[PDB]
Design a protein around this ligand. Structure first.
Ligand SMILES: O=C(Cc1cccc2ccccc12)O[C@H]1CNC[C@@H]1OC(=O)Cc1cccc2ccccc12
Length: 305
């Protein structure tokens, strides 16, 4: 089996992406934020959000005694882009985002006392190939595919790189970076591929080197990160995947005025200092076609597009 679903930015800044997901029988369609940095499928259930009502689903069953963290848990039939999983744990929680669909490793799932599997892990027992791909758009819709690689969706070849599952994330090591037309610096940067995080969070050294190339940019403790004059044209940012390179255009790094009408704009590359981990969020991922390979030895692939 395979599935293919369109994912759409929730706003003009690409602050997050929502993907329609069918839950229950008859189907209830909820717009979920696909999050490769967490491992729970949770939904608002029975300020604008569409809710899941398990009492209206003939296939819903309470997963008795199970809670997540806190709310209850049901199992039900869940379909994404034509791909159906029966007995999926759907976690019930109390305005464009109707819930989350976690796609990190199931070891991060929060259900107690019986930990539950992600939609991807459950689907693996049917997929043509144990993979899913993220093809996020810049200020435009994109695609999540399950079970196949669309060879028309990228240019050149896919460079695969090793993944550590020790922390439950799609954790990998970038081989370096460049700012604009500058020289590429070969240096190992460990981080996670996280579709549920908006921005690119990298070590302070790297981030300072980037913003130093933008006249008037500075880190503002008041605002909570790097800001830059809205009048600026931003340089691109390149990250390494093995010997390959992914180029993030400067425009992808512009997150607009810090407050309505302000001439100070918020940067899309920020320091990870304090987070405890580097995060290749949407700003980075949307510059690439990204393969989440869930084979026995998981890996991550990146192609230009
Ligand atoms: O776990 C959740 C689920 C979740 C809960 C509540 C609201 C949410 C809203 C949107 C999406 C997911 C949500 O989201 C995490 C994983 N990916 C999105 C987000 O990470 C970052 O914020 C970033 C972040 C910061 C600090 C520490 C981190 C440690 C590991 C990984 C990410 C970290």
């Amino acid at each position: 089996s395979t599935g293919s679903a369109t994912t759409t930015p929730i706003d003009s800044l690409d602050d997050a992406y929502i993907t329609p997901v069918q839950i229950g029988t008859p189907a209830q369609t909820l717009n979920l934020d696909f999050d490769t940095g967490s491992s729970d499928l949770w939904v608002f259930s029975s300020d604008g959000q569409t809710i899941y009502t398990p009492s209206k689903s003939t296939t819903a069953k309470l997963l008795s005694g199970a809670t997540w963290s806190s709310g209850d848990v049901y199992t039900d039939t869940v379909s994404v882009g034509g791909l159906t999983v029966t007995g999926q744990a759907v976690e019930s929680a109390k305005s464009t985002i109707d819930g989350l669909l976690g796609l990190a490793f199931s070891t991060l799932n929060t259900v107690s006392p019986t930990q539950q599997k992600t939609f991807f892990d459950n689907a693996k027992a049917s997929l043509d190939s144990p993979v899913f791909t993220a093809d996020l758009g810049y200020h435009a819709p994109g695609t999540y595919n399950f079970g196949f690689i669309d060879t028309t969706a990228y240019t050149g070849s896919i460079t695969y790189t090793a993944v550590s599952t020790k922390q439950g994330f799609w954790e990998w090591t970038s081989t370096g970076y460049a700012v604009g037309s500058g020289t590429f610096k070969s240096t190992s940067i460990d981080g996670i591929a996280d579709t549920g995080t908006t921005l690119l969070y990298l070590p302070a050294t790297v981030v300072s080197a980037y913003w130093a190339q933008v006249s008037g940019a500075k880190s503002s403790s008041s605002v909570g990160g790097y800001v830059f004059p809205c009048s600026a044209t931003l340089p691109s940012f390149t990250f390494g995947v093995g010997s390959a390179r992914i180029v993030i255009p400067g425009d992808y790094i512009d997150f607009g005025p810090i407050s309505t009408g302000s001439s100070s704009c918020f940067g899309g590359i920020q320091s990870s200092a304090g987070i405890g981990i580097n995060i290749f969020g949407d700003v980075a991922l949307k510059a690439a076609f990204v393969v989440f390979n869930g084979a026995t030895t998981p890996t991550l692939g990146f192609a230009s597009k």
